[PDB]
């Protein structure tokens, strides 16, 4: 056989490739089309590890499913991108991209060039951005009630909607506590310093955000106190054990007393470390590495409570919460490195496990959200919803601009684009107006998932949005009726909707540019 390319290299090209990509994309869309809005239904996903994922989150679903078509791969990747960037809109983006590709399929069948369609799409994207920024409204982030309404408008579409007030307060408290500024750089890191601990059992209504942190740990020695009412805390990266040296420190003994002298020297080293620690008069000592039993003895003699092997992330959160500074050489320990600010250290038994609380802190720049519920699956879903809520709160605190929900924004932008298209005289007006009408899929999907008449309601809504001051009009996802968002209260973050539109349009552009698939070749 005299081939030019290796066998298994199959090359497709042309309108078959284009239609295949578009069908794969809109199939990915149809997978999660029903998971949008407040009246969505749960899906039970089966992990490869025998696990289960019961969710409504578009990115969760697309992350748990596996595909082989590269267009579907790209759609899953843009869902992941949206989730990592804003943490919401993971299915709105998918649906918008699917609809944009669907409407572009039309122009592609009619001999229009993909580059023409793409340029039209980019024009339309710029004008979408302009219209969103025009219809947006500001927010007084000091209004806790306004923020709680934003968070309700973001979690109402999820399972925790039954405990909306609780989850909103939890998310708001967590983000406002994680808000931190140092050297003129504001930073809301709700991934390293807002921790969610899921303890199955109990009831969800007792879930709370702690003014401190929580770890799954016990005292190293049962003579140590488990309750301290104003603990001075020391954090260490180093082992309080006697470990070997970095070099070949081999010893050579010829005298009798030398062996015992060496063991006593080890003991004296441990004593000296523990004295370097006691000199700061702490109440609690927390290490990322081990603590030898002799060190425990000396600390207990000093009336100190020790926790042996904590994670580096938990130690960083304890630092941020109690106001301490992690050290690695107790000789280099300073009063500024000691942790004052914690109001209570408690070690209580939750079920049959011992959990260490460092709560009651003042000005804690880190937190632990203690979630309680019926099962690991319910609590995983609650945690995902709380991640959504906190990411929305963060997006707001960063960009205080709001836009109306319920598809009101989508209809306003579609109307603005249709109005702007009348000045266009070239051939791109048609794809431009097509993406405009492709934005209607969000209210369309809302109506479909509530169980109302899409034709009638979308017609009434497109008509309402042709009047002058009606760009806030949208739909209820709970009754199937048109309402004013100023009266309903469903307001999304401008950043969220901007990222949604941008990711959707760029995904459409990418998949339109794509042609001529090739495969088989091995890295």
């Amino acid at each position: 056989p005299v081939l030019v390319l290796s066998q298994n290299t199959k090359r497709e090209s042309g309108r078959k490739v284009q239609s295949g990509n578009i069908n794969a994309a809109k199939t990915i869309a149809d997978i999660i089309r029903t998971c949008l809005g407040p009246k969505s239904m749960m899906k039970m996903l089966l992990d490869p590890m025998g696990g289960i994922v019961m969710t409504n989150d578009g990115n969760a679903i697309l992350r748990e499913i596996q595909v082989q078509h590269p267009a579907a791969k790209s759609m899953i990747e843009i869902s992941r991108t949206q989730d990592e960037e804003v943490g919401d809109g993971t299915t709105s983006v998918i649906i918008l991209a699917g609809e944009m590709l669907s409407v572009a399929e039309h122009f592609l069948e009619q001999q229009m060039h993909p580059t023409v369609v793409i340029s039209a799409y980019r024009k339309a994207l710029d004008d979408m951005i302009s219209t969103l920024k025009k219809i947006s409204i500001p927010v007084d982030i000091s209004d806790s009630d306004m923020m709680l309404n934003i968070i309700n408008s973001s979690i109402t579409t999820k399972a925790i909607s039954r405990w909306s007030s609780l989850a909103c307060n939890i998310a708001l408290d967590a983000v406002k506590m994680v808000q931190f500024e140092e050297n003129g750089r504001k930073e809301i890191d709700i991934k390293k310093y807002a921790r969610v601990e899921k303890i199955p059992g109990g009831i969800i209504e007792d879930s709370c955000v702690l003014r401190g942190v929580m770890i799954n740990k016990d005292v190293t020695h049962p003579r140590m106190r488990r309750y301290i009412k104003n603990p001075r805390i020391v954090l260490l990266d180093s082992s309080l054990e006697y470990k070997k040296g970095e070099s070949q420190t081999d010893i050579e003994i010829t005298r009798e007393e030398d062996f015992t002298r060496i063991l006593q020297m080890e003991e004296e080293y441990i004593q000296q470390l523990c004295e370097d620690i006691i000199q700061l008069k702490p109440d609690v000592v927390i290490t990322e590495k081990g603590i030898s039993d002799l060190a425990q003895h000396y600390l207990m003699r000093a009336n100190i409570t020790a926790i042996r092997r904590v994670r580096k992330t938990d130690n960083n959160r304890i630092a941020r919460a109690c106001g301490a500074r992690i050290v690695s050489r107790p000789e280099e320990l300073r009063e500024d490195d000691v942790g004052t600010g914690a109001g209570l250290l408690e070690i209580k038994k939750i079920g049959d496990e011992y959990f260490t609380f460092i709560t009651d802190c003042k000005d804690p720049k880190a937190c632990t959200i203690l979630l309680r519920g019926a099962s690991k699956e319910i609590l995983s879903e609650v945690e995902r919803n709380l991640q959504d809520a906190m990411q929305v709160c963060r997006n707001v605190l960063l960009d205080p601009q709001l836009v109306p929900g319920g598809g009101a924004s989508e209809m306003a932008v579609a109307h603005a684009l249709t109005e702007k298209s009348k000045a266009m005289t070239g051939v791109e007006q048609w794809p431009y107006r097509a993406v405009a009408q492709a934005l209607e899929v969000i209210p369309r999907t809302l109506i479909q998932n509530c169980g109302a008449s899409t034709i009638r309601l979308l017609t009434s809504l497109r008509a309402k949005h042709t009047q002058e001051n009606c760009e806030t009009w949208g739909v209820n996802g709970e009754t199937g009726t048109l309402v004013d968002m100023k009266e309903l209260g469903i307001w999304e973050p401008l950043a969220v909707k901007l990222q949604t539109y941008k990711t959707a349009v760029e995904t459409a552009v990418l998949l339109l540019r794509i042609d001529d698939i090739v495969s088989g070749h091995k890295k």
Partner: protein, 307 residues
């Protein structure tokens, strides 16, 4: 002579272990029941460091057997020399635990370590002077990854002054064997470097090649046992961090190859954050993976210090 307790975790570990405990038993005359059907006195000379003689002259081995899924320990009971072991040294859960390191190292099989630890105490108590432990497991794969490192950890907390000699089945380069092996192996190496004293890297790829050369799945557990006895049948680790070895016939720096491979597949998957939701949603912070990676670049540079 001090005694050595031998833990074996995971399918790979539980199937190297039985073969080792058979090779040595035949090297000592002990039959499946445990009776010393042997004549030479050198078999009994150093038999106290491995077997715990009971009344009736039945030499029970000092071996624990762990896996979150009972079906491997059932195959060990039913297998050959599957009856010398103590009927209480078999510690098993009911959950399979898949091949997730977080699943094996966290609450999803964490209470079990508290059932293998009251068997380590009940096995050390018999030992007059406990030399240390020998844990046989798999670096990345099934439970051996997660459960094999939560064991090194909790046994280095409970007995922090004893030799911990691990035998780990490092992943073969050609065969991925799993989609999350890069993660499990960097997360396990990140624990073994600290909580271990000497590690023997048994590469399945090289072992398979050696078996093919001998010919000119069981065959690998039969070609790892003669090496495990040539290591434990009778001047190393100059630096207390380069304690990884490649057996043969070796504290070679060829380990650096394996580590470069593992850390480049780890970094490839970490860049796209592929298969990370499971770990974060089951009990890891996204920073433990950065720490693991950092510490593997550490290792690779410590090993690159020579050449």
């Amino acid at each position: 002579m001090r005694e050595i307790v031998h833990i074996q975790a995971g399918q790979c570990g539980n199937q190297i272990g039985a073969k080792f405990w058979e090779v040595i038993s035949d090297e000592h005359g002990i039959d499946p029941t445990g009776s010393y059907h042997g004549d030479s006195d050198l078999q009994l000379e150093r038999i106290n460091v491995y077997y715990n003689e009971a009344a009736g002259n039945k030499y029970v081995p000092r071996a624990i057997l762990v896996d979150l899924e009972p079906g491997t320990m059932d195959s060990v009971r039913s297998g050959p020399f599957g009856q010398i072991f103590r009927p209480d040294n078999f510690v098993f859960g009911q959950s399979g635990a898949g091949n997730n390191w977080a699943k094996g190292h966290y609450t999803e099989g964490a209470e079990l370590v508290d059932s293998v630890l009251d068997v380590v105490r009940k096995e050390s108590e018999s030992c007059d002077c406990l030399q240390g432990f020998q844990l046989t497991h798999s670096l990345g794969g099934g439970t051996g990854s997660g459960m094999g490192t939560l064991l090194i950890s909790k046994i280095r907390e409970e007995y922090p002054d004893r030799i911990m000699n691990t035998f780990s089945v490092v992943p073969s380069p050609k065969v991925s064997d799993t989609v999350v092996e890069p993660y499990n192996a960097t997360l396990s190496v990140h624990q073994l470097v600290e909580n271990t004293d000497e590690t023997y890297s048994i590469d399945n790829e090289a072992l398979y090649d050696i078996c093919f050369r001998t010919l000119k799945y069981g065959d690998l557990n039969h070609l790892v046992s003669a090496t495990m006895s040539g290591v434990t049948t009778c001047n190393m680790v100059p630096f207390p961090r380069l304690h990884f070895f490649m057996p043969g016939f070796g504290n070679s720096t060829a380990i650096q190859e394996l580590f470069k491979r593992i850390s480049e597949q780890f970094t490839a998957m970490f860049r796209r954050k592929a298969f990370l939701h499971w770990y974060t949603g089951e009990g890891m912070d996204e920073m433990e993976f950065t720490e693991a990676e950092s510490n593997m670049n550490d290792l690779v540079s410590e090993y690159q210090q020579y050449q």
